Amino acid sequence: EIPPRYCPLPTARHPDETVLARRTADWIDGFDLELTPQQRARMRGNDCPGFYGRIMPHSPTDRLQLAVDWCTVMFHFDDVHCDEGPATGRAARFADLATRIVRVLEAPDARLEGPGDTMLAPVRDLALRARRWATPAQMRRCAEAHRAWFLAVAWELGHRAARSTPALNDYAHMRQHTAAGAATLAWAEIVDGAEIPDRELSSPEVRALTELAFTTAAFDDDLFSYGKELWVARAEGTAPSGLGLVEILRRENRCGRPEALRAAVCLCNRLTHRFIALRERVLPDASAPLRAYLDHLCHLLPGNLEWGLTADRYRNPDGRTPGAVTTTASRDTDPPADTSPPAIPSIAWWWD
């Protein structure tokens, strides 16, 4: 039971999810991943078309397919190449693969395949399709968003190998990157087909809006995937992972699980309010591509929640247990009473 979330933003579904699902399943099947039926079922439970369709419900299907296909292969990357394989040489293996992915995005004919490689062929295909539509700056943004994601995953793998729990001030600014927030959303302006001006994207107010949105969505992800984490921990007989806002607040405040859930939701509510309030100040002078970017972030927050609460990824985790985890949520219609910055110095500047 997730305490009431404040997110007064409308959500909508793309009308062509079935087509996007079919094409993305056909697309990923065309490479050399040797997907088992269990793996194909898990990808269905991921519902990539439902996810990105909620971010861009009005976009043309053939263009949105590019972002859906990226989600498809990167969910597989997460499940198969992040914190997997032999413990010996795990960090080195990840850094090796991660840098090849980034290079293929920059140089699709780099020919970096190794013995048994599977990931680079679809990545190359995404980069080649992206380059038909994207400006050079947009392609650069994709590569750098992937670097920020992958450096954060290397950070995260260190905590998982130590089974340690990050301090809140560290998690609070890193979580947007372990969630690949920017790498997920970089595809949007390519789908839209117009470059967001660098001076806008780089301005402090837009940087704040960007980090606010990606952090809120990732914390929401921590909340609607918490049940699956407790499921895994119970199956494997271990404590839940410390890589999650709920467990971080539980450890930091020496509180119960219900109290930590309330504190996590309270933080999400304050970030969401700040995003909305800062949005109102930025929109008057925003260019049309910036306005579209902020529209995508506005659909991301409620769309991410609806997707995460209803996708089988966080309800039937292994793909063989319908209803193993059921997460419920509420909508708080009242804004947070406290609109001041939280005592988290790594993110406090969002309230500047």
Numbering used by the authors: 12 to 363
Study text:
We recently discovered the cattleyene synthase (CyS) from Streptomyces cattleya and studied its cyclization mechanism through isotopic labelings. Some polycyclic diterpenoids have attracted increasing attention, e.g. gibberellins are phytohormones derived from ent‐kaurene, while phorbol esters exhibiting the tigliane skeleton are currently in phase II clinical trials for the treatment of acute myeloid leukemia. Their biosynthesis is attributed to diterpene synthases (DTSs), the type I of which catalyzes the conversion of GGPP through diphosphate abstraction and cationic cascade reactions. Substrate ionization is mediated by a Lewis acidic trinuclear Mg2+ cluster, bound itself to a highly conserved Asp‐rich motif (DDXX(X)D) and an NSE/DTE triad ((N,D)DLX(S,T)XXXE), to which the substrate's pyrophosphate docks, with assistance of a highly conserved Arg residue (pyrophosphate sensor). Here we report on the crystal structures of apo‐CyS, CyS complexed with GGPP and Mg2+ (CyS‐GGPP‐Mg2+), and the CySC59A enzyme variant.
